[PDB]
């Protein structure tokens, strides 16, 4: 592995993609936590914070935040490894019968 690409692991030549849930000494700028967060129903009770304090939250907690421009949402530090390909592909195969 290398500090340049901290998101890969090379074993016997094969490559492995490590998820981005936590950021250790090498990783950089809050781009290594995004695979640990996800969107959820908006809750005005949770606090509003920045993109740097986002690391001091607890797994499974909620927090409001500002995104891009003129947009606020609510995030939760819980991931979802599943994608839509399989779910669309498999579900469509169960309809041609």
């Amino acid at each position: 592995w290398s500090k340049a690409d901290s998101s890969k692991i090379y074993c016997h030549g094969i490559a492995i993609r490590v998820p981005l849930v936590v950021g250790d000494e090498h990783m950089d700028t809050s781009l290594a936590l995004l695979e640990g967060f996800s969107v959820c129903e908006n809750d005005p009770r949770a606090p509003m914070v920045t993109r740097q304090d986002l690391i001091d939250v607890g797994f499974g907690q909620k927090v409001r935040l500002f995104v891009g421009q003129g947009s606020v949402r609510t995030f939760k530090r819980t991931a979802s490894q599943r994608a839509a390909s399989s779910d669309v592909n498999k579900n469509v195969k169960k309809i041609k019968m």
Partner: protein
């Protein structure tokens, strides 16, 4: 800080008004863009005359005021006027300044610690410079040139991307606080972003310029130009200094930019996986898609997913086409019949049935299209423009430079049009075994005759003989082709024209969404086939470097 407090005070003062409040309250933020146009609108017809007249004055420019005070810029050194306290009508916060004022700053003025960051901002042009410096020029000669027109790329670029994949990259490197939700391209390409971010961080810079330069660093400039010789971006960027219609400055530029190697490796991988999936009988489609998504490859330093590169390239090969079709990737209207290349110019038609007897009496169905249609065709170092009419090759013209290539192109064209008696009565040499179905997968008589030609040269000679031969009439001696591929003879083939000078490749900025079958044969809203697995080399062994075939 205090500046922040000032911004807050300004916002308050502005909200105290009614119109400003109404506009900052109504609608969304996008309205800003609109507001950006209704202001500062003024153009000029001939900026040249205006510029000369304008610069003639004694304080022709505008400039900031506080920047001058802070820069301790005076109004004279040895009696030359440098600026004067005043206000432009548009800005209202700028002051008219002299041309001499700029010179003053550069010669003696406010020095900065370092500026090598520029080399990264304009990396493309420093790369141009270096590529130039590593050339070994050669003699100059005069002669006529066969410059063919065609669409090509002039800017060498690594990791060519789309536009949506850039509008995001320009943020995570420069404006992260204002960043949007993380897109998939980011999560996938993390190291790339980290690299682009390591250089433009903690630096005094104008960011709009950086974003513009990044757009150029990721844009292959596609142009429709005349071209001669090899085709590589390293050359097209300076073609102006290599040769024209009457002159040529020889120079060797082969060992630079290592571009086409990536493309040939990609195509080899595509061929490999296509064959692998073809080994199947009922799920080659899903097998191929799995092989795709279960694979990656290295580009320079970074590791990229195959399916991502495939949707960025433009190599019109019978392999890349299939893959881009499986992934639902749209593409251009370009055909492929074996090794040759084809493109339709005009005409139409529809499928039709016919049969032929292989040996004695053995009926075998073969199809052919109905009304007249023009086609351009491109084989190795050879071009052609022909027409088909109801299972016949009406006419054809050629502008190549080789006899062998000419003959092969002509034969493949004759096949593509099912012209001749062989399609009416196949030869004895072929049999039911050579017919089709290596293991069950049928084969149209077209590719059958194709491989039958590629097998022996004498099959090709006989096929050419199938085309009418006559005596070379007077005058047309020059525009005639023998059996060997000679520009003139005493007896030549029928309905043929030759000439020196390639044909201008057509052009069309169109896209189509096609599909494919379980036998790996793509269709385009019609019974026409654009690609298949019979038009590619049979097989070959290669050792791929810096690749990841993460599949059992």
């Amino acid at each position: 800080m205090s500046l922040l407090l000032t911004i807050a005070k300004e916002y308050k003062r502005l909200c105290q008004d009614a119109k400003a409040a109404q506009m900052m309250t109504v609608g969304t933020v996008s309205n800003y863009t609109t507001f950006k146009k209704w202001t500062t609108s003024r153009k000029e017809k001939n900026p040249s005359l205006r510029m000369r007249w304008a610069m003639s004055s004694k304080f022709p420019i505008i400039a900031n005021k506080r920047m001058l005070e802070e820069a301790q810029i005076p109004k004279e050194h040895n009696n030359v006027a440098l600026w004067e306290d005043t206000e432009d009508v548009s800005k209202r916060d700028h002051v008219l300044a002299s041309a001499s004022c700029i010179n003053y700053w550069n010669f003696c003025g406010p020095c900065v610690n370092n500026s090598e960051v520029i080399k990264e901002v304009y990396k493309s042009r420093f790369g141009r410079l270096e590529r130039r410096k590593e050339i070994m020029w050669k003699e100059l000669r005069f002669t006529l040139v066969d410059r063919q027109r065609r669409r090509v790329d002039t800017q060498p670029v690594e990791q060519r991307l789309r536009t949506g994949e850039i509008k995001d990259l320009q943020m995570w490197t420069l404006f992260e606080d204002e960043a949007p939700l993380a897109s998939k391209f980011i999560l996938d390409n993390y190291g790339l972003v980290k690299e682009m971010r390591s250089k433009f961080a903690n630096k005094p810079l104008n960011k709009e310029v950086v974003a513009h330069m990044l757009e150029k660093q990721f844009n292959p400039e596609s142009r429709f130009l005349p071209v001669f010789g090899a085709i590589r971006p390293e050359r097209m960027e300076l073609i102006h200094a290599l040769g024209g219609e009457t002159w040529i400055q020889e120079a060797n530029t082969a060992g630079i930019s290592n571009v086409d190697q990536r493309k040939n490796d990609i195509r080899a991988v595509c061929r490999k996986v296509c064959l692998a999936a073809n080994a199947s009988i009922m799920n080659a489609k899903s097998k191929l898609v799995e092989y795709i998504k279960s694979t990656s490859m290295r580009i320079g330093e970074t590791e990229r997913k195959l399916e991502e590169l495939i949707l960025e390239t433009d190599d019109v090969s019978p392999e890349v086409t299939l893959c881009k079709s499986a992934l639902g990737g749209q593409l251009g209207k370009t055909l492929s019949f074996g090794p040759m290349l084809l493109k339709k110019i005009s005409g139409s038609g529809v499928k039709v049935k016919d049969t032929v007897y292989i040996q004695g009496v053995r009926a075998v169905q073969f199809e052919y299209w109905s009304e007249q249609e023009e086609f351009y065709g491109e084989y190795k170092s050879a071009t052609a423009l022909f027409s088909r009419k109801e299972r016949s090759l009406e006419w054809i013209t050629i502008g190549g430079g080789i006899n062998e290539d000419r003959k092969r192109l002509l034969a493949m064209c004759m096949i593509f049009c099912r012209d001749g008696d062989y399609f009416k009565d196949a030869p004895a040499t072929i049999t039911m075994a050579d017919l089709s179905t290596k293991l069950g997968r049928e084969i149209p008589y077209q590719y059958v005759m194709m491989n039958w030609i590629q097998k022996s040269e004498d099959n090709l000679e006989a096929l050419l003989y199938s085309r009418g031969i006559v005596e070379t009439n007077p005058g047309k001696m020059g525009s005639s082709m023998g059996i060997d591929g000679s520009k003139r003879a005493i007896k030549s083939l029928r309905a043929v024209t030759i000439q020196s000078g390639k044909i201008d490749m057509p052009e069309s900025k169109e896209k189509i969404h096609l599909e494919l079958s379980d036998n790996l044969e793509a269709f385009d809203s019609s019974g026409r086939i654009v690609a298949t697995i019979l038009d590619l080399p049979s097989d070959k062994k290669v050792t791929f470097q810096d690749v990841s075939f993460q599949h059992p």
